[PDB]
Amino acid sequence: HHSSGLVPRGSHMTAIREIRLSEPESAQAALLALECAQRYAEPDSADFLADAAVLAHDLPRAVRREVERARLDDRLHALVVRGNDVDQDALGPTPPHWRQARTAASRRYGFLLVLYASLLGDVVGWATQQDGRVVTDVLPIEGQEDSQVGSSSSVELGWHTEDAFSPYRADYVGLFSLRNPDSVATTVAGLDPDLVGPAVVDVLFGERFHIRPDNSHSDYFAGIVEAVENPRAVSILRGHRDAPQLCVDSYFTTAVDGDAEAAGALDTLIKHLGGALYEVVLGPGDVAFLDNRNVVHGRRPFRARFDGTDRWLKRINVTADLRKSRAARRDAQARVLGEA
Amino acid sequence: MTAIREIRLSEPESAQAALLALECAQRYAEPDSADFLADAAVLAHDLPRAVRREVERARLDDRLHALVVRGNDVDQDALGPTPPHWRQARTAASRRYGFLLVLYASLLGDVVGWATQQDGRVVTDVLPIEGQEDSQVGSSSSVELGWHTEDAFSPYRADYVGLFSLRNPDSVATTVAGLDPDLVGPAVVDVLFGERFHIRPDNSHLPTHNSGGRLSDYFAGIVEAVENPRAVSILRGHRDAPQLCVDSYFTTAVDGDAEAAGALDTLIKHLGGALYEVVLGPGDVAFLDNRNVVHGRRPFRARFDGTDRWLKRINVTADLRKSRAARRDAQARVLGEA
Ligand SMILES: O=C(O)CCC(=O)C(=O)O
Ligand SMILES: O=C(O)CCC(=O)C(=O)O
Ligand SMILES: [Fe+3]
């Protein structure tokens, strides 16, 4: 049976918006994805992406109503849609590297992730991330266990706003779980301004910080070297005091040189978000969209087997405003930030 | 060549759009009722598929001038006379066209209004008013409405302006112009990219074009933008596809910037000449890409007998979230209530 509900975290009453698909809704979504996989080259080929926002309207109406409520909820942490069909037998083993992960068997899940994502905005990728793929792959890679990348395992992926340094950072990060046998969690935290000193909040609204590109990062790539060496003074909080946006990276954010008050406010915020971290576990066929304007995210330490049974998610970036990044894209329809 | 994208509705597609608009009119009070606007994006998806396909092509075309949907059903007899003032233009009979404008608009983005335009109505009215003939507002007639980016002064200016023509018996043209950067050359383009201009609010944001009972403080932001305009660019984004932000009556170069004043002078003559006509007949709805084109309206003689030209107008944003600092609360659509 279909159900939807609001799951609170701390004082965030609509932190998590959860939708459970009925079996007919799951079947309808799967049929649409399979039809797209029959009619279009790739989940992020130009032919499909030109049509993606119209085809997304063919998803179940009850689900579209709930996704639309999430899209306009400026206090959302995560929209979670549970109960999509994943045929584990037909999917086959978890690939050993993202370079081997754009498989024929998994295409239908890429298509479905783009269809859900296109209800929230327009899908984008990054030239420096998994060869500029829009639908990317999150799976453990042997040798990457202790790194601060999505392919890590043994070491906690430190929490951050996705692409925090960038004015073109996504509005949503989408995750479609294909398999997660050991129930490994995405970590999530938002700011509760009622748990932080108003003076600290005032400081975080100041353009008193440097957010440098993470290592996962030419007119465009000139700005990337400049962002490292001569970072612009930016705020961590922006917008309305009642609904501030958050932009911070637990490993790549500093106060401006000599701004001790700003250094203090930043470490107060880092301790607050560290303490407020909670978890979202996506079983097979569960999809989450994190509101990247409101939450930082990471991933818990876990034990990868590297035997083809490991955790595997499809991942996507979504923007509310594709047009605003045109200076960083190759042409009108191209979705790859930093391609030209 | 596809700067103007036209969809002519078949009778069935027109019928389907009308039935959806009437279903909305039966359910909700106003075409900008909060409950309707919450539901609008999903209801918009019930518009004809062929129409949604062409609107989506328009939405992602970053060189679009206007999407024009021709041949919506307008029952002229049932609509009754053109109101003599926008304040009186929220008529029972015209509600269905307000709802339909929002449904089309909600395929392109989220609808917004302004605290300082027609009392913060999201669906506004464009009709001639006695005493406004020679003004630079939408209710003018005798004097050409000078071309402009809608709300050029504001960082929260719309991505699309929607115009639903209810009535246009004398085929009065909307005017449109984009910038071809190649046709003006990289020298002027480089100047127009500089934060070297002042863009002040147009006269529609003044207390004289709102109800007298509206709070003085709604206008504080507008008056500040008139007295002390920020230094801003006219062009932004990619050199291959730059966005345009300029107003023929309210844009100046910053004091002492002779090179900027020259570049502005060149741009005005370029846009003024290329300025071309789109006639919206009854049932025609246009969405102007406000990032790409300035627009205006040709001069005409109003009859003031209830038969005059009448458009419904709406502002559309690609990104409602970005203006949250200027809105009362999450769902509120009226810019400048904060
Ligand atoms: O593995 C996860 O659950 C989250 C992935 C992630 O943090 C990321 O790639 O952005
Ligand atoms: O009357 C027209 O066609 C244009 C109206 C307009 O430019 C406006 O009201 O903003
Ligand atoms: Fe206008």
Numbering used by the authors:
A (entry chain B): -11 to 205, 216 to 338
B (entry chain A): 1 to 338
The authors write:
CmnC is an α-ketoglutarate (α-KG)-dependent non-heme iron oxygenase involved in the formation of the l-capreomycidine (l-Cap) moiety in capreomycin (CMN) biosynthesis. CmnC and its homologues, VioC in viomycin (VIO) biosynthesis and OrfP in streptothricin (STT) biosynthesis, catalyze hydroxylation of l-Arg to form β-hydroxy l-Arg (CmnC and VioC) or β,γ-dihydroxy l-Arg (OrfP). The overall structure of CmnC shares similar folds with canonical non-heme iron oxygenases. The catalytic iron is bound by the 2-His-1-Glu facial triad comprised of His148, Glu150, and His295.
